[PDB]
Amino acid sequence: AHHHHHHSAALEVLFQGPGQPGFCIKTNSSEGKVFINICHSPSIPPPADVTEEELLQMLEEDQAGFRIPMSLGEPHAELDAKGQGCTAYDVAVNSDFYRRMQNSDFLRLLVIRIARQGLEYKYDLRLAPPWDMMKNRPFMGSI
Ligand code: NA
């Protein structure tokens, strides 16, 4: 049961480079460990212009969700630190937006939730609630 009219969402786009690593979220699904590589490229469109306070207001008033264009990469298998296979997904946002998000905890939290949601629906995943920023590794895998 719910009554809200809007919710933040991934606007899936075709990845277009040049991409580069950003940061990596470790989490689990119902099936195993998952790494989400939040990457960025200038050729991913930005979200519509909005200030942090305008966006919080729209959330409070249920007048919009944050709609972030992002590519939702296909899975690639990678080894974790213990030598076990895990699934990684590369999710790219716009570079200007990424630079803004570096200076905002609020925008970062939105991106993480939205990337999780996009991958969950695209790949039929049930990510478990806990997740962690990888401190010493911006990207799980190569490139
Ligand atoms: Na809402």
Author numbering: 2 to 144
Recite the paper's sentences.
Engineered small non-antibody protein scaffolds are a promising alternative to antibodies and are especially attractive for use in protein therapeutics and diagnostics. We proved the applicability of this systematic procedure by selecting a monomeric single-domain human protein with a fold different from previously known scaffolds. The newly developed scaffold, called ProBi (Protein Binder), contains two independently mutable surface patches. We demonstrated its functionality by training it as a binder against human interleukin-10, a medically important cytokine.
To generate ProBi-based binders to IL-10, we created a DNA library by randomization of 10 amino acids on one of the ProBi surface patches and used the ribosome display technique to screen for ProBi variants with the highest affinity. The random mutagenesis of these 10 positions gave rise to the maximal diversity of more than 1012 variants, which agreed with the potential diversity suitable for ribosome display. After the fourth selection round of ribosome display, we selected eight random colonies for two-step purification and crystallization trials. We used commercial screens for preliminary crystallization trials and then manually optimized the conditions to get better diffracting crystals. We started the crystallization with seven variants (G14, G21, H25, H33, J61, J70, and J93). We observed a crystallization process of six variants, and only the G21 did not result in any crystal form in our tested screens. Four variants created crystals with low diffraction quality (ranging 6 to 8 Å). Crystallization of the J61 variant resulted in crystals diffracting up to a high resolution (1.2 Å). The fold remains stable even after nine mutations at the selected positions. Because the affinity of the J61 variant to IL-10 was only in the micromolar range we continued in the effort to develop higher affinity binders.
